[PDB]
Amino acid sequence: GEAPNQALLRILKETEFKKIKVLGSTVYKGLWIPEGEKVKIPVAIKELREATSPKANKEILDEAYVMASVDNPHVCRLLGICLTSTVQLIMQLMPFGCLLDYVREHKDNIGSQYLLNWCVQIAKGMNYLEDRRLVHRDLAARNVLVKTPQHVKITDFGRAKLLGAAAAEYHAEGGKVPIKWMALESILHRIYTHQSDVWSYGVTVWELMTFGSKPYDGIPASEISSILEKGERLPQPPICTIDVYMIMVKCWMIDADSRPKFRELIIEFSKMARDPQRYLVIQGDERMHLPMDEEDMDDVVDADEYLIP
Ligand SMILES: */[SH]=c1/[nH]nc(-c2cccc(Br)c2)[nH]1
Ligand code: NA
């Protein structure tokens, strides 16, 4: 019916971590020293907030299932889980944070080469999730992390659903949903496909090309479906040639099958990335430049160079 999932879930002991500092609020940053391996791995630890909630633990372990089952350079991977009172996911440290905050903070230093390269990397991540019959359902600039300015990865598998062997669409049943990133068929009929992820990819690319503007800003979510039905779409960003904007608009077609495939978005953004100043017009583009303190950094290895059978 479907291939067995032989991914390994690694259970890590509390004695393998040296939690250096705290990131957010319960988000933490630290080092993972696998039991006698002479390696230190920078990690982000997501430890449980409420901690009292059986519902919270079901959801955290669903995320861990998906993150443990993915292996791609443009997708965040789970190093393992810590089975203490609060169930923690241990993940690779992405030291520059979310791409949304990164484009807001560094507008003045982001050239066309970075922007179009990010678009290719996200399309590659999303194409890999499709090969794995996985629908993300929450693609947004906030859910892409920056390992380096040259290297981003898709994250937040909180809404991710594995399509059934014979189930092309997933049918959801209510909650707090990200309306402004969602395909029309998802807002109306709670239908979700690879093609509805493409719609979200479009909105994500618009966030990047506007240096992190809020889509349909100051419009309440209740009217978004009506606006889209009338045929309104997000406006052409100033830096965007019609070439780039036409690709975004195709991601926002009402016929889901008329939207591009992730594999096509890889091709189209790659061609544009070979001649970036022809596709994005940014003031001062040719000038733009983009790039921790623990006692001993000698045995530090990035998770991406730390592989296990
Ligand atoms: S690749 C990766 N590293 N950190 C994270 C992460 C941080 C905070 C929230 C989530 Br869902 C993931 N993933
Ligand atoms: Na979506």
Separation CA 12–CA 70 (nearest Å): 19
Report long-range pairs for 160-166 (Cβ below 8 Å, ≥24 apart): 160/63, 160/66, 160/129, 160/134, 160/135, 160/136, 161/134, 161/135, 161/137, 161/192, 162/66, 162/132, 162/133, 162/134, 163/133, 163/134, 163/135, 163/193, 164/2, 165/1, 165/2
Hey, what are 67's tokens?
């993150």
- Non-local CB neighbours of 165 within 8 Å, separated by 6+ positions: 1, 2
Residue with tokens 């001062």: 284
CATH architecture of 1-93: 2-Layer Sandwich (3.30)
Active site residue 275: no
Residues ≥6 apart with Cβ < 8 Å to 207: 100, 103, 140, 141, 213, 215
Residue ranges of the domains in the chain?
1-93, 94-291
Beta strands in 38-143 (DSSP E): 41-46, 78-83, 87-92, 134-135
Is 68 close to ligand 1, i.e. is its CB under 6 Å away?
Answer: no
Atom of ligand 1 nearest to the CA of 153: 1
Residue 88: CB within 6 Å of ligand 1? Answer: no
Residue 200 in 3-state DSSP?
A: helix
175 phi, psi to nearest 5 deg: 150, -160
Residue 92's DSSP bridge partners are 43
* Identity of the residue numbered 143: N
233 lines ligand 1 (CB under 6 A): no
Resolution in A: 2.4
Amino acid identity at 49:
R
CB 96 within 8 Å of CB 102 = yes
**Which CATH architecture does the domain made up of 94-291 adopt?**
Orthogonal Bundle (1.10)
Token digits for 105?
């903070």
The residues near 218 (Cβ < 8 Å, ≥ 6 apart) are none
